[PDB]
Amino acid sequence: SLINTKIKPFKNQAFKNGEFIEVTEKDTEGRWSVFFFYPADFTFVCPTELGDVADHYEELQKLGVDVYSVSTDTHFDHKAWHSSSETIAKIKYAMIGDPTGALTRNFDNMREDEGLADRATFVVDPQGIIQAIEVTAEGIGRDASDLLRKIKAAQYVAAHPGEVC
Amino acid sequence: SLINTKIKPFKNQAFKNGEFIEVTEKDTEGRWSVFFFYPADFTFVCPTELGDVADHYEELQKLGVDVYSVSTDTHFDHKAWHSSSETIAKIKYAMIGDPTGALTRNFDNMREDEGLADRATFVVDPQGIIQAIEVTAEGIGRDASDLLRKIKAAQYVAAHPGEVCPA
Amino acid sequence: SLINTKIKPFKNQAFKNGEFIEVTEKDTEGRWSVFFFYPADFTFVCPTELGDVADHYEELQKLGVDVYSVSTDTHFDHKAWHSSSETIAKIKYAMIGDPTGALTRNFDNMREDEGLADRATFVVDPQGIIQAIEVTAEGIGRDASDLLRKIKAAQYVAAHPGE
Amino acid sequence: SLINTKIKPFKNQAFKNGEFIEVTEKDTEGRWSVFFFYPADFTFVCPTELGDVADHYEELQKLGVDVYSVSTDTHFDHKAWHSSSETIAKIKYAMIGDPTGALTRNFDNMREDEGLADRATFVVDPQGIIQAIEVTAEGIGRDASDLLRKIKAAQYVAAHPGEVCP
Amino acid sequence: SLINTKIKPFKNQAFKNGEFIEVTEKDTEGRWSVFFFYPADFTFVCPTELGDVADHYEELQKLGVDVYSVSTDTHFDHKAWHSSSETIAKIKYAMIGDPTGALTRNFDNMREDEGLADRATFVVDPQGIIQAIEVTAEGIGRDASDLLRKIKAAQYVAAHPGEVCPA
Amino acid sequence: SLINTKIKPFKNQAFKNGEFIEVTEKDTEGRWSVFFFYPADFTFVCPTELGDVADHYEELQKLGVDVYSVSTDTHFDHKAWHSSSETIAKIKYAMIGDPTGALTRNFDNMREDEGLADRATFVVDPQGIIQAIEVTAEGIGRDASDLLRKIKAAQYVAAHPGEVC
Amino acid sequence: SLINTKIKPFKNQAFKNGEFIEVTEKDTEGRWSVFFFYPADFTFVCPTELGDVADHYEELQKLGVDVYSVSTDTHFDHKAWHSSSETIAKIKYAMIGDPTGALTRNFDNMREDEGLADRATFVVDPQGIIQAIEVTAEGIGRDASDLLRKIKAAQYVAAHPGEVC
Amino acid sequence: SLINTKIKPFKNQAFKNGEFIEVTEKDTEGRWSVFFFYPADFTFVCPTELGDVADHYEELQKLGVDVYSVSTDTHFDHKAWHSSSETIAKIKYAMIGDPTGALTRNFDNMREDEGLADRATFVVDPQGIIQAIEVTAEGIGRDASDLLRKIKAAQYVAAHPGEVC
Amino acid sequence: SLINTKIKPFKNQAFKNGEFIEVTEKDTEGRWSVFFFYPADFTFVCPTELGDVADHYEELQKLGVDVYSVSTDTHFDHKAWHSSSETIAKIKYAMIGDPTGALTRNFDNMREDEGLADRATFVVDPQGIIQAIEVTAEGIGRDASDLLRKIKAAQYVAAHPGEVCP
Amino acid sequence: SLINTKIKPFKNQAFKNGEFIEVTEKDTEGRWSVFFFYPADFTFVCPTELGDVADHYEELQKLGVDVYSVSTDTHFDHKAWHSSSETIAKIKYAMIGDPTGALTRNFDNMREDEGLADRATFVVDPQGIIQAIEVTAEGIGRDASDLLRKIKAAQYVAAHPGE
């Protein structure tokens, strides 16, 4: 598994609050990060998962947790989806475009016969170590609350090593 | 990741309710399965992840879901752990022993430098397809409630394809 | 080089006049085909290259020529772009999505460090033979009228060998 | 593709306005270049494609654009063809001979079964980068006027980068 | 075989008299060692091979010989076994846990299709040299007396080279 | 290890009671066998180990156990050692000559830098499976009695599978 | 050396006084053939090597010998040269064009650096065997006469096998 | 073709009228050299190819040209033949023996099947460049005269670089 | 070694009593053979080694033993040497020429730096098996009489297998 | 082939006139050496080849020539054979044991399917160059007198180059 391994370098374009920015692993150093992968923009299914996370963004930003959603679509596709869907409109975190598939492959999360990323979520600590991984098939939603619980538990463990039980 | 792939064949010994049985993939066919991996028997750590799943074992069974916990310890170690801890005593589902690590590796869940499996839960459908994967570092904890919600969502989706919110 | 070579097999989803369909090389057998690749949907560059081919579409259908535009975006992105841009809404031909990049790599037309296809147009005959190729860097536009000319000429040649 | 790649070093003999010269990639550096390949000298083929580029040469020169025609024939063959054909005689640009096939292969444009180059045109910028490619089958025809439009467009873009759509 | 080669470096956790310690090759330097490998803790089999060695542990210690039993179970499993069986309770020497199987493999003693070590005893001298090797199938049994005789012969031979019967 | 593995084919010349015979794995099928390796004939150390075994030969033959001693010396060397040493003279079992080293390598028992076999003893059952292995450095003798005990225990286990304890 | 080996198959377009034809190894089968290679058409070098062969063409055709000139130029280039040079217009044999260079390479006669064949002459018997080779650097000429003497003697040995001395 | 390439280094024993010498590429440096190859000594074939070269030897030595005959026989074989054949005794140039076949192979002139060189003649300028090659099958002869004409013309181009037409 | 190995197929031209013949491994089958290699024909070297084998040829023939001398020289060179030397002229056995070096290499006896075979003698039995080998440096000398003793011994052993020591 | 090649380095134990010694190539440097290989100790074949070399031993020592017999048996087997056979007891030169077969393989003289060396003799000069080789199948004996002759001749040649 990738559990307990260090994320790999990357450099991608992203759409964040009306602006196009460049994101690299440098931007994640010293921070808690959530890499939220999904297959494709503009599909016919409502983006509730991406919306759930947007609903907890403020609380996540309070926890010092940056959020990066990722699909193999471009940041141009992301900008357009943001201004055409009420749910995606709520998104304030960075929406990374990964058309080369490199970020997705770094996380071993590519459906090679589709060129689309699987529904996986990765929690990465300040040293770049993956502490939690969640992957689900279509239809099985990822609960943003449970994600919050894990990130809080992970942050605790980092501050209280040796959770005596 | 292994999401959406078919589980690989396996043959392991296990301890289930005072008995030693053999478990293979044939045992999972036609059924929903949860494979619950943990690092080591007799560990000072809160056997909290194993007990909570034992608690919801009633519901799971109502839903036609079989449960298998797995560690690189042997079934003999499982039997002994079962009759030495009250928390582990509640377990009525099979406790698989994976000393060769083949089951753990089939699910790409081995901590190679420790010879112990990582804390991971897998949901497998009746056709052997992995529908949900969860892996966490020590101390983070897997919520058996969120698991139940996922299983029911997986079952719902298998019965009613295409009934998700329209954009 | 690809000139005078046969196109490779492919299977991709596309958006065509309101519907999602599957397109494969078998759909080109016995027909004249134009594969029009471009970089990305929704960019700030003038959608003029795609819209102009659309203007000449009815005429191309009259000559028995099918048109397929291709980008590494999905057919979902294409549908969205088609209903949000007026120039793209004019498109009645198939907009192929190539997220795996296989169709693009078949025509050796991928910018590997971007994951986007280069601006290239290919003219393919009924036997699957590429008779014309045009590739341009960004900012240099492809002329639909010149494409039309080359297509009519390709057809003449086919019907009147040597001259 | 070769699109957006830098041309490769080369050294060939060429016929240009009565004299024999030697062309290398050094001559193209810092200039806009058009490499116009064709199959063979002395062919029934309506030399209309080469003669038409000649018709735009004066304007091309005025824009800083050199032109080189290339065939796998020798520069000797080019001299001869240039004196026996009225269309070819209108040519004032260099006529490169590529009998080793090297130049043609650098541009991946050899018909390996015939030993002749395919009908292709390449626009190369001052830094050696290919900005436009065009290849056509026998009898289809390249439009010198469209070539001109492409060149102006490329020159325009080199000067005004990131020209968004108004 | 490994006869006459130097043991390889290793780092394992162990259980020794109610404590968890770390054992490495540095621990064996300058000492005589017996590495006693067995297949699995909590096994119904006569813990007879492990108890007899515990009995002669007194003499061995008189001779400056350290003892280490090893199985692919963890130290946690060893602790539990130690406080659940009277026979295993007699053990006062280190019980090494080898879940990664690296120690077992260093001594080329792994049953690969079981993930369990074979019944093997190794005698290692102060310089790390393997002087005696014994491996037996299940049911055959290793005699701790013959072991003692070998160790004393190995010690005698190290102190008095060349004093063997003349032909 | 070689424990629980099947012996490999071999074909060697041997010296047995005044005669030269050929031994192959065929001769071991259906029988219990002991392969007793030693480094070299005619050395200056008394062959007590080979003699101990000769002392128990009769009892071993009663148990249906064939004995084959082995060194990389020839059967010619063996014949000569037999008629020149009182201890080796007592030997009635076959003394295999292995100058090619093939039998010794089959049992992974060659000291490659010496061309001599190590002091190893292998107990093989009727199906050709190795059930016991004993290897010792020079000076540490192999006790023929303990060998008898193991062979008897191994023969028991074969007749009473599942030694309930 | 290719001396005494059999020519390799080939198919080339050629110009034979007025029209375009295709020459193959078949055209040579059961016939004496002379392959005359030269570097390039329309060259400032006096075609004395090509025209001098033409002169002996009548005598050659009588002996049952065909002539093929060969250069890496095309047959189109050949027709043009045959109409702009008196020396060349004298040619009645086939002028083979070899732009792929396969014919030249079949005879290992290519100046890989220039993509032009060297000045070489070959004599091939009816069975396709090369009986005489001649190569010269630009300047040293190839004797028309000598070529004839060679062919004559070559043909003698043809009917009268080795005439010992 | 080896035409226009530089000869390769070589060291061979040779017989030059009466004595044994060693020839090297050095002996050729700054000198016009002619390498005359033939299949074998003491052959039933009339040495008209070797003796006829001898005749023009005086004229050749005048032009500053050396002659080396070459066969895969040894120099010992050469001395013997030079004393049992009038035609051969006429030879005053060096008769190189090439039993290893390196000299012949340097000139790609070996009949690998017979281990004998082919009937070939080479002209090498002072800079070591081969200017003329000639190979013939047994029967077709090599013209002494022609060889001379070649050398003469070859030397003209030497001082008077390319004399355009 | 080559000792106890079967000779390899071969085909060479040889000079034998005035005529040119062709020898192949077929001729050695069912016979006892001696392959006597030497460096070169016409050498100052005292032809004493070859002449001495000649001296025993009559007896060798009487025992069913053919002899073949081999050098990398041609069979032509052998004819000549045979007529100009009184020692060589005493030879009635085949003189094989091995200019390709093949035969010599089959017996792994080529001095690769000289293109000449080393001074070696091989005794080959009716089944093609090499029973005796002898190689010596220049100037050491092979004894034809010892060769004879070896051959008789080999013939004796082929007839009386396993001749223990009385 | 090995003729005119230099012997390879080796290190082996031997029995020599009552003692066990170590022999290496360094012991041959600057001396004339005879390596006499044979199959096996204690066989039923007549020990005549070894005993005859022994008869010529004093003379060989007089010429500055060392003799080493070699078999794949150990030096222990050699000692035993030397004290049990009268023909072998005559041996005063070194009897090398080659159980690893390395010395034998150096001289490419091993019968791989038997693990015994072939009957071969090599004459080595002070510079380690093999000047003479003789190999024979079983039953065909090697003559010590002829060996002596070749050795004296090898020496002449060394002292009088060309003649």
How would you explain this protein's 3D organization?
The structure is a homodecamer. With 165 residues, the first copy, chain A, is α+β, with helices and mostly antiparallel strands. Chain A has one domain: Glutaredoxin. In chain A, the strands form two sheets. In chain A, strands 2-1-5-4-3-8-9 form a seven-stranded mixed sheet. In chain A, strand 8 and strand 9 form a beta hairpin. Chain A is globular and about 50 Å long. The two termini of chain A are 26 Å apart. Chains in contact: A-B, A-C, B-E, C-D, D-G, E-F, F-J, G-H, H-I, I-J. The interface between A and B is large, with 38 and 38 residues.
Determine Rg of chain A (CA atoms, Å).
15 Å
Series of secondary-structure elements of chain A, N-terminal to C-terminal: EEEHHEHHEHEEEEH
Fraction of residues in β-strands of chain A: 25-35%
CATH class division of chain A: Alpha Beta
Biggest sheet features of chain A: 7 strands, mixed
Counted by DSSP, the helix tally of chain A is 6
Q: Which term fits the overall shape of chain A?
A: globular
Indicate the percent of residues in helices of chain A: 25-40%
For the largest sheet of chain A, list the strands in their spatial order.
Answer: 2-1-5-4-3-8-9
Would you tell me the structural class of the helices and strands of chain A? Answer: alpha+beta
CATH fold assignment of chain A: Glutaredoxin
CATH architecture of chain A: 3-Layer(aba) Sandwich
In whole angstroms, how far apart are the ends of chain A? 26 Å
GO molecular function (chains D, I): NADH-dependent peroxiredoxin activity; thioredoxin peroxidase activity
Subcellular location (chains D, I): Cytoplasm
Catalytic activity (chains D, I): a hydroperoxide + NADH + H(+) = an alcohol + NAD(+) + H2O
Function (chains D, I): Thiol-specific peroxidase that catalyzes the reduction of hydrogen peroxide and organic hydroperoxides to water and alcohols, respectively. Plays a role in cell protection against oxidative stress by detoxifying peroxides.
